[PDB]
Structures are given as structure tokens and as C-alpha cells.
Amino acid sequence: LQSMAAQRQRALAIMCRVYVGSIYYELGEDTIRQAFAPFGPIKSIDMSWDSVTMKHKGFAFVEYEVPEAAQLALEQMNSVMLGGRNIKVGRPSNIGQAQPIIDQLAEEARAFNRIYVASVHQDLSDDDIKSVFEAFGKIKSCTLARDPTTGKHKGYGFIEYEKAQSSQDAVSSMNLFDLGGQYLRVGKAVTPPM
């Protein structure tokens, strides 16, 4: 049980992480941060680094605090052009051990009619978001993640609909919906709630 939990933890950690390649040599950490921040709060960026030539190696790993953020980045950032060059995005490379759990967690997410919303402007409240998103169906809950130390929300949250059709409609329609002067990023849950 401690072993099963550990494998689960290791799988969720992999799912929070996005490989980014073909980074133009003139670009760096900042450009990656700005380009990948819309999908959720970035826990860290791990730049490739040649410690002899003191240059990055054209790739990096972006680590999100929530797996759906990494999912959105994976789905929406391939063939994005930064500094004149198409970047490449993928899941981390050594994940054979974790892939069953990744797939299990995505199958288990389905029953909850659960969607993830990022790039929520600070001016907007949970009820602002709920009111916009309840156009698609009746919403069982609508919770913006909040930083406990500050009380302000973290620009993302989750919505649970009563009907699966509703959550599917919201996802198809509301990715890049303009709200609060920012483009929302929206996608399905990739785990059951925890």
C-alpha cells in the first residue's frame, strides 16, 4: 500500500512535467516561462545545460503544480513558434513504469464530469467563472485554487458538471474564451479529484 501510493505519486509527478525541445539558442528560461505560464502555475523550469560551454542544449522541462496544466501544454504547444523556430513538446522520456497509472488515472477521471480552467484573471471570482460556465449545464461545483498564505486565487480551478455532455461542451467551446481580458485555457480532468 505504501508501495502502491509511491508508484501513484511517481506517476502524478511525471504527469506534471512537460518536455520542451528545439528551443532557439537565443531564447531562455524567461521565454519558456511566459509561453508556458498560461496553462497553470509553473513550479519550476529545468533548463538543459552544458556546464562546459555554459549554454543550454535546446531543451528544457517545465513542471506544473497540477497535471491537467501539463496536459493542456502538451496538447496546445506543439508547433508553436518561439524566436523564429517551432518548438517540440512531449511527455518525459523514461515513463514505461508509469504509463499504466497515467492511463488508469485518465479513465478514472471520466465519471466526474470534471474540467480544468487556467489563466483566470485575478479580478474574477469563483462565482464569475461559475456564472459563465453554467451556460453549458448544471454545475455541481466550481472551485478556484487559492494560495492559503495569501487568500488570493492561483489563476486556475476545477469545475464539475452534473452531465458529461456539459463538461464536453464547455471544454470544446471555452478553451481560449476571452474573459477578464485574458484567454482562458480549458481542458478535461486527467485524474479523479484528490
DSSP states along 58-73:
S-EEEEESSHHHHHHH
29 and 101 inside one domain: yes
**Which element (helix H / strand E) includes 116?**
strand 114-118
Of 85, 112, 139, the residue that ends a domain is 112
82 and 121 inside one domain: no
Contacts of 108 (CB under 8 A, 6+ apart): 191, 192
Q: Within 10 Å of residue 157's Cβ, how many Cβ atoms? A: 22
The DSSP call for residue 48 is -
Q: Which three cell numbers stand for residue 89?
A: 513538446
Cα maximum dimension of the chain: 58
76 and 119 inside one domain: no
Q: Within 10 Å of residue 64's Cβ, how many Cβ atoms? A: 25
Residue 31's nearest CA partner among 23, 43, 41 is 23
133 and 82 inside one domain: no
62 and 2 inside one domain: yes
- HSE value, Cβ hemisphere, 13 Å, CA-based, for 175: 16
Do residues 15 and 108 make contact, with C-beta atoms less than 8 angstroms apart?
Answer: no
The Cα 106–Cα 159 span in angstroms is 16
33 and 128 inside one domain: no
Q: Which domain holds residue 136?
A: 113-194
49 and 122 inside one domain: no
